[PDB]
Structure 1
């Protein structure tokens, strides 16, 4: 049992000293969630730029496709791009018709 105590401590020392430890993924998640939110504001900007091009090639200003709430902050903004890609596919379907 004293060996198993020392063997448990060696696994615990391994999980703390390895490179892909928890402190790596706290750093990766915290940095990427900062990038992903800033990249969200850039892509919604061009989804609105494409809507302004849609509103100018056709005479309509009341027709809007990019709607708020693609970013859900309570779910870390996951599926924000899947929501916008659907919204881009609704402009292009409306453009073709």
Structure 2
């Protein structure tokens, strides 16, 4: 019985080494935390600049429409497309609407 208990101890030790190996493989993964973090940082900066450019385009198209209809009172780009509640997402859908 004591032999069986000692081999159970060794079984637990092997399980601990296995968890170590899983963690190290997760950290040496190609698509790891550093890769994802840099990718989303770059995409967030790009999205931030692109929203400014896109809203400028929307405003100048609205100016073209105002000129065409000779009605300066129409307003469609009301602002708030980039809202803090959603970290800037749905700005494209708002501008499409």
TM over 0.5: yes
Q: Extract unaligned runs of 5+ from structure 2.
A: 1-11
The answer to whether the 8 Å contact 1:47/1:66 transfers is: yes
Larger radius of gyration: 2
CA-CA distance at 1:35 after TM superposition: 0.4
- Cα RMSD, aligned residues only: 0.9
The unaligned stretches of length 5 or more in structure 1 are 87-97
Which of 29, 39, 42 matches 2:50? 39
Higher relative contact order (CA closer than 8 Å, sequence separation 6+): 1
Report whether the alignment pairs 1:30 with 2:41: yes
Residue-by-residue CA offset, 1:18-44 (whole Å, 9 max, x unaligned): 111111111111111110010000000
2:32 to 13, 18, 21: 21
1:57 partnered with 2:57: no
In 1, Cα distance between equivalents of 2:36 and 2:89: 17
| TM-score relative to the length of structure 1 | 0.84
* Runs of 4+ in structure 1 over 3 Å off: none
